[PDB]
Every structure is written in C-alpha cells, then in structure tokens.
Point group: D2
Chain length 112, copies 4
Amino acid sequence: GPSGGEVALEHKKKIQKQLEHLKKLRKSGEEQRSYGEEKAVSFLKQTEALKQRVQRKLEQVYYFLEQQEHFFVASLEDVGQMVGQIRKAYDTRVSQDIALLDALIGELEAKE
Amino acid sequence: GPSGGEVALEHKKKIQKQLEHLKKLRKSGEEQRSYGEEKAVSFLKQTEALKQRVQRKLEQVYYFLEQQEHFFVASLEDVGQMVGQIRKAYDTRVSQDIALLDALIGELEAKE
Amino acid sequence: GPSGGEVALEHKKKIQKQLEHLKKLRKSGEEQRSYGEEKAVSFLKQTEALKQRVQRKLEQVYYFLEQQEHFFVASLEDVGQMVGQIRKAYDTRVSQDIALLDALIGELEAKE
Amino acid sequence: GPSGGEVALEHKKKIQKQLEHLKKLRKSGEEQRSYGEEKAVSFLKQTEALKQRVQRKLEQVYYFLEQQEHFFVASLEDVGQMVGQIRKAYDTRVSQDIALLDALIGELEAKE
C-alpha cells in the first residue's frame, strides 16, 4: 500500500497547493479592485482637464469676437464721420459758388 | 454803322444769354448740394444696415458657442457618470468574489 | 464517534459546496470579461459618435465663415462701385459747369 | 453828366469784377473735381484695407479651427487607446484567474 506516512504527506501538499491558488485569486481580486479605482480616478481627472481646456479655449474665442465686434463698429463709425465731413466741406464750397452767382444774378436783374 | 436799333438788339440778347448761363450754374449748384445730401443720407443708411447685419450675426455666433459649450460639458459629465457606474459595478462584483474567497480561506485555514 | 456513514456524508457535502463556490467564481470571471468587452465596445462607439458630431459641427462653422466672408467682400465691392458712380456723376456735372464758365470767360476775355 | 472818362472807368471796373468772380468760380470748379477725386481714391484705399484686414482675420480663425479639430480628434484617439489598454489588461488578468479556477475545477471533477 501507500503507507500512512506518504498519504499524510501528499494530502498536506495537496491542501497546500489549494490554499496557495486561492490566496493568489484573492490577491488578484484586490489588485483588480485597486487597478479599477486608480484607473477611474485617472480617467475622470484627464476628462476634467479636457473640459477645462475646451472651456478656456471658448473663452479666448468669446473675447476675440468681442474685440472684433468692437473694432468693426468703430471702423464704420469712422466711415460715418468721413462721409459726414466730405458732405460738409462740399456743401460749404458749393454754397459759396452759389452765393457768388446770386451776386452776379441780382445785379444784372436790378439794373435791367 | 450798325444802327442804334441793331446795337440795342445785340446787347439785349448778349445780356440775356449771360443771365441764362448764370442761372443754370446756380441751378446746377442747388442740384449738387441736393445730390450730395441724399447720397450722404443713403450711404450712412446702408452702412448702418451693414452694421446691424454683422451684429445680429455675431449675436448668432455667440449663442451658438453657448449651446455647444453646454452640450460639450454635458457630454463629458455623462462620460463621468458612466465611468463611475462601471467602477461601482465591477467593484461590487469583485468584492463579492473576494468575500467568497475569504469564506473558502478561513475554512481550510481553521481546520488546518 | 460519527460512524462511517456520517463522515463519508459530511465530506461529500463538504467537497460539493467547494466545487459550488469555485464554479460561481469561474462564472463570475467570464461575466466580468464579457461585461468589460461589451462596455469597452459601447464606450468606443459613443466616443466615435462624439468625434463625428464635433466634426459635423466644425464643418458647419467652416462653411458659415465662407458664406459670410463672401457676403462681406461683395458688400464692400458694392461700396466701391457706388463711390465710383458718385465720383463720376459729380465730375461730369462740375466739368459741365466749368466748360460753361469758360464759355463765359473767353467771351469777355476776347472782346476786351 | 458823369463824363466819358468816369463812364469808361465804371464799365472797366464793372467788367473786371465780373471776370474776377467768374474765374474764382472756375477755380472752385477744378478744386471740387480734384477734391472729389483724391477722396474717391482715399475712400477706396481704406476700404481695400478693411477688406484685407477682415480676410487675414478670417484666415487666422480658419487655421485656428483646424488646429482645434486636430487637437480634439487626437485627444479622443488617445482616449480610445486607453480604453483599449485597460480592457486588455483586465482581460489578461481575469482569464488568468479563470484558468487558475479551471486547474482547481478539473482536479475535483476527475478525482470525484
């Protein structure tokens, strides 16, 4: 037969190997739950950063449109003022032509 | 000699043409002043139109960036929730395995 | 003590519960692997959808900037052609006025 | 009577004062044509400048979108490659745990 000695032996080893596999499995559990955690934390963290990058960009754009809106209205205001001064200057001039034609008019008319 | 009659005639005509060429010039002055004004009025007007068009536009761009900013933060919030629920559901599950491995461990390791 | 029948019994029950726990653990493994796959799949999918949505958007912005740039150059082209017509219409008119003043100039200048 | 002398005198002055007003008016004419020209030239020129400023802007904006589109698709590719690697690493680790239960399974299921 096998003998009481060598039966006890193998069973001891046998239960040893078992309890070894199990405790790994349980280690692997804890690492798995750990990797999951740190990875979820990392994910959320980066994502946050994406959310802020994209925001800070949109701010930069917002303000850029405002400055451009501003510059644009000011250009056209400026145009406004120019058309105004070219009008005025011509008018002053043409009416001085006209006042001087009236001079020439009334005099021929009033003697005649 | 050219006669007193034909002298008087030529002068009369000669002085009429002059008063004619003058009163045109004066008419022509009033028209230039009038055209100048109308056309400054118009120019300003269209310019104003251009001004508002661009604003009302930039307004459309502004609100469009808001909508998209909203949709973007909200997408990423969603991702947030998902990652989270995927961390919880794995955790629960793995921790179940673990406590069930512990059940197996104590047992071997207390008859041992 | 227990008798042959009650040890054989307990051991049978004992090895059964064990195999019952192991095999759940093995089922729970397969579920875990399956869930992690289906969930990587859907996450990638949604991501993709995010990718194309943002793209489809930027496309819409690109072409909007093009149509507006277009309208703007054409607007200013218009301004150009208007300034040019008001310049021409005034020139024609003044040079008439002028050519007629010359009519009157040479007249006196030539008799005197 | 006023004497042939002081009649010749008045007429001389009278005609002088006329050819004087009529030559100013004619100068005033060509100055009007000159002023309107250089001011058409100036107006067109600034306008041209406005035209090109708006373009070089819209050109800066366009390239800015391209770069953001680029950064965005790369971020998400990145996310892609991450999800994949986390999927991979769990998978290895779980099917490993599995095979280990399969070692434990067949053992009982062949001695039994």
